[PDB]
Amino acid sequence: HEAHIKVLRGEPTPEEMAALMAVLASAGGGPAEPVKKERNMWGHPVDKLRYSVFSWQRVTLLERTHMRR
């Protein structure tokens, strides 16, 4: 059920196929280890704001920002 690369017009020889795939694999740049980054809420912007003592954003912005995981 994976999405495969497709070649739509012409057929390359095995040498041309290897060169095409090899250069595209080289173009596959990135982190080399893509995973969920370490959470660190220290000094998050939502703690910096002034909230009125009765402001509903204390629920729907501040708390949800801290508690969401």
Binding site: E2, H4, I5, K6, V7, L8, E11, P12, M17, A18, M21, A22, A25, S26, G28, G29, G30, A32
Partner: peptide, 18 residues
């Protein structure tokens, strides 16, 4: 895996290019 015009084709690669 690569498809070419309706062929399935397998290509093997070093787990090393980055």
């Amino acid at each position: 895996v690569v498809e070419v015009g309706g062929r399935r084709l397998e290509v093997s690669l070093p787990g090393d290019l980055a």
